[PDB]
Paper text:
In this study, we have determined the crystal structures of bcPadR1 and bcPadR2, which are the products of gene loci BC4206 and BCE3449 of B. cereus strains ATCC 14579 and ATCC 10987, respectively. The bcPadR1 and bcPadR2 subunits contain a typical wHTH DNA-binding domain, consisting of helices α1, α2, the DNA recognition helix α3 and strands β1 and β2 (together forming the wing), and a dimerization domain, including the C-terminal helix α4. Unlike LmrR, but like the other PadR-s2 proteins with known structure, the bcPadR1 and bcPadR2 dimers have a completely closed dimer interface. The closed dimer conformation and inaccessibility of the conserved tryptophan residues of the bcPadR proteins are incompatible with a drug-binding mechanism as observed in LmrR.
Residue numbers in the entry:
A (entry chain A), B (entry chain A): 3 to 105
The structure:
């Protein structure tokens, strides 16, 4: 699971870029897309840091059901970095995947 | 190129596991499989460390052409770790690649 953490910040940015989500909603999506080890508790410090670096930002909005939650959205800086991640990832993915099938 | 370094040790183990190679031969293969930034100079400290951790081992063998070179081969410990890398990689690769194609 040591490597899952390398790409976790990028996948969090991707998810948030596509939909405003609150903490529990985020980790649930992460779980169901294959990050089985993540929990709100384990990624919390990463969320605090991504905020301090202004990649994402939480705002208190009312939910479709009424109760007010802290939804996170991506900043312009965060989007720039998301694009960097997508580019790097497709590069490394292609490079490593082609290699490991040589025989 | 910050992420290319995460998986570089594993790809080096893969390559060495498949063929005994000397330093220049190794970096050439790395270049031609898409690690365009690597050079003998840049990966040297990583090779020294992989040796100190007993993942790979160099031995002075004679080349098909005669001159003696320092060829590297993988240790049992190195092979174990290579299998760990292959498992982790296929997991993360699948997880990230499926995610980044949601829309």
């Amino acid at each position: 699971s040591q490597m899952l953490k390398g790409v976790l910040e990028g996948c969090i940015l991707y998810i948030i870029s596509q939909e405003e989500v609150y903490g529990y909603e985020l980790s649930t999506k992460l779980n169901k897309h294959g990050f089985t080890f993540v929990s709100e508790g384990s990624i919390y410090p990463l969320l605090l840091r991504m905020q301090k670096e202004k990649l994402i930002e939480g705002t208190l909005k009312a939910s479709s059901l009424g109760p007010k939650r802290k939804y996170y959205h991506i900043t312009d800086k965060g989007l720039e970095q998301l694009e960097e991640f997508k580019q790097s990832w497709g590069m490394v993915s292609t490079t490593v995947n082609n290699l490991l099938q040589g025989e």
